[PDB]
Design an enzyme around this catalytic site. Sequence first.
Site, mmCIF file in Angstrom:
data_model
loop_
_atom_site.group_PDB
_atom_site.id
_atom_site.type_symbol
_atom_site.label_atom_id
_atom_site.label_comp_id
_atom_site.label_asym_id
_atom_site.label_seq_id
_atom_site.Cartn_x
_atom_site.Cartn_y
_atom_site.Cartn_z
ATOM 1 N N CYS B 172 -4.509 -5.955 5.993
ATOM 2 C CA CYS B 172 -3.095 -5.759 5.676
ATOM 3 C C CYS B 172 -2.193 -6.420 6.691
ATOM 4 O O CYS B 172 -1.344 -7.195 6.280
ATOM 5 C CB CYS B 172 -2.629 -4.315 5.430
ATOM 6 S SG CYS B 172 -3.390 -3.203 6.641
ATOM 7 N N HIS B 232 -0.993 1.390 7.252
ATOM 8 C CA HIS B 232 -0.941 0.237 6.342
ATOM 9 C C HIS B 232 0.384 -0.487 6.393
ATOM 10 O O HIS B 232 1.382 0.093 6.801
ATOM 11 C CB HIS B 232 -1.188 0.792 4.888
ATOM 12 C CG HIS B 232 -1.408 -0.236 3.825
ATOM 13 N ND1 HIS B 232 -2.425 -1.155 3.918
ATOM 14 C CD2 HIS B 232 -0.752 -0.434 2.664
ATOM 15 C CE1 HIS B 232 -2.337 -1.906 2.832
ATOM 16 N NE2 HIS B 232 -1.346 -1.512 2.051
ATOM 17 N N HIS B 244 0.581 -7.009 -0.620
ATOM 18 C CA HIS B 244 -0.259 -6.464 0.438
ATOM 19 C C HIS B 244 -1.737 -6.744 0.186
ATOM 20 O O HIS B 244 -2.113 -7.148 -0.908
ATOM 21 C CB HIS B 244 -0.005 -4.935 0.613
ATOM 22 C CG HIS B 244 -0.356 -4.068 -0.560
ATOM 23 N ND1 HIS B 244 -1.001 -2.856 -0.388
ATOM 24 C CD2 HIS B 244 -0.110 -4.241 -1.882
ATOM 25 C CE1 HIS B 244 -1.098 -2.322 -1.596
ATOM 26 N NE2 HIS B 244 -0.595 -3.128 -2.525
#
Lengths: 297, 297
Positions: B172, B232, B244
Site C-alpha cells: 500500500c 493502510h 490502493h
Amino acid sequence: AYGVVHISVCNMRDEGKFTSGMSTQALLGMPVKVLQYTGWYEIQTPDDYTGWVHRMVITPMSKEKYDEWNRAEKIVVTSHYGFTYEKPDDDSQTVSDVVAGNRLKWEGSKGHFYKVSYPDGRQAYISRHISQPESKWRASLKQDAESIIKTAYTMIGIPYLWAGTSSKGVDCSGLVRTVLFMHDIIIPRDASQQAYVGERIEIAPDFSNVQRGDLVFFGRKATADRKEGISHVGIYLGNKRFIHALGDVHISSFDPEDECYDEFNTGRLLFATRFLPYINKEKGMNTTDHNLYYLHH
Amino acid sequence: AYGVVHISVCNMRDEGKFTSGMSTQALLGMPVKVLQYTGWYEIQTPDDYTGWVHRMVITPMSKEKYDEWNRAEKIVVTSHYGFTYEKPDDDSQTVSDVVAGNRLKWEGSKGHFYKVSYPDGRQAYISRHISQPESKWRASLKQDAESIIKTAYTMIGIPYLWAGTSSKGVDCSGLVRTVLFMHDIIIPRDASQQAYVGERIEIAPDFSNVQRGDLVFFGRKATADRKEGISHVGIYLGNKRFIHALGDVHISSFDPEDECYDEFNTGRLLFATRFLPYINKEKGMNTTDHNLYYLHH
Ligand SMILES: [Cl-]
Ligand SMILES: [Cl-]
C-alpha cells in the site's frame, strides 16, 4: 475446494500472514486446490507444493467451473512482461500486467489483439505480439535442451528473489521452474526435490559426461555419518559453464581461466541430473496437458 | 561506507538472511549508504530506511566514486517494464530487465538506443521508447495531483507484494512510493511515517474538503488510553474513490452506491493528508536533485 489464480503472480507464504516468509509463487490462470480458509487460503499448486495466499488473489470455484476453466482454450503469455487493455489499443487503460506463463480464457480476436477474460470475470485485450493461442503454442513447442537453454539466456540479469517463480524475479530452483513452465513443463519446486528426479550423473573430472540442459547440484557432500545436503542448483550449458540465479540470473564457470568462474559453487559441486528425456515418464515431472490439476479426474 | 544498486530491483530484508522478511526494495542505479557488512550488507536508502541485502546486488564504492556516479547524467527508465541489450538491436542478447525509476549512466547514443553503463561496469543499450536523459526528463516533469493520479492508473491490476516498492509489485505505501518515484519524489517508506508528513485533513462527512492527490489513511482510531494505529494507505481520486494496493492495485469507494465500495476500509478511514504542495519544504519529503544521498556533502 478449487480455485484459479487471477493476478499475474501471487505470493504463497509459509503461514496465512504477510509477516511469514514467501515459499513459492503461482501464475494468472493457474488452477489450484484449496486446502483450507482462515481469512487466507491454503492452496496447492500443480507441482503439489502448498502455501498461503490472501483471500482476494484467487477465484474459488466449484469442481464444475474449475473443470470448465481448465477445458477452455487459453491465450498463453509468451513474452516475459506486458499488459492487457480495456480496448484493442495499447494506448487504452490497462487491466493488469502479465508475465510469461500467464493463461487467460480466449474470448475472440480484434485487430492485432486477442479478447481475453480473467478467472474473476474481468474482460481485456492482449497483443498477439506477446501472446498466442494455446493450441497454436502447444503445436510449435520444443522441449529439448537447446530450446530450454535459449529461454534461460532471455532471463540473464533478472533479479534473484527468494521463492521467486516468475519472470519478475527467481530463486535458484525458481529459475529452473520458470524456464521450464515456458516450455509447458512442471518439475518439483524445491532444489532438494529436483535433485532426485531424472537420471543422476556422477560428474567426470573433465565434465565430458555432462550435457547441455542437465541440472547441476551443489551442497554438502555425503559423509559416512551424514547424507548429502542440497543447497543450490543451475542449468549446465556445456564447456564447464552453467546459468543460475544468485544475486541475479547469470552465467558462471567451473574453469578458473574464465572471468565468470564461481569458486564457492565449483568447490561444492555434487552431481548432475538428466531430466528432460523423462517428462511424463516419472512422478513429479509432467506437461500441463498431462497434469491432473489441469484435467477432470 | 557507500554503495550503488546494480540490479533492476533489490530486496531489502529485516535481517541478513533470505529466511527473514522483506522490509522494502531499492532500484538499479540508486545510491545507498552501507552501514555494515556481515556477509550481507546493511544498507540505507535515500528515504532513510534500513534493510539487508546479499553481497552481490550492490556495488560498494569509495565516497569519490559514489559522488562521481551521482554526478554523471543518467538515462532514466520511464516505462514500467523492459530490457537492456548488448547491441543497439532489441533482437540481441539482453543484459538485464529494467523497471521505471531505474537509472543508468548515459554513455552515448546509437540509432533509437542510448548507450548505458551499470554501477558494476556492465555496458548495454536501452531503447529511447522506454527511457530518456535525466536532464530532459526533469525539465518535462509534472508533480501535480493530476500527473500523480495518471501514473497511479497505469498500475491498475499490478499485484500486491508485501514490501513491494517497484512496478513489479507493490504494497500500500509501496504503491505511493513507486508512483511518486516516477515523478522524482521521495517520501517516508512506512504508511505510519507517511501519515505524519504534509497537512493532516480532518475529513468532512461529505468528503468536500478532500482533494484529488491527497493520501487517505486507515487503521485504529485514537482512544483516550491508546494512540491511533496506521494499518493502510490509498491515494484519493475525488468523488469518494481511492486507488490502493490490496490483493492487487485497484480502485475502491467510500460510497455504498458504487459497485467498487470497500466496506472494511471505509469503516477504518481515519484522515487524509495533503503532501504534494510540501515537497522540498518539510523533512522526509524531497526530489532526488534535493536529496543528500544523491549529492556531494
Ligand atoms: Cl531475495
Ligand atoms: Cl504478498
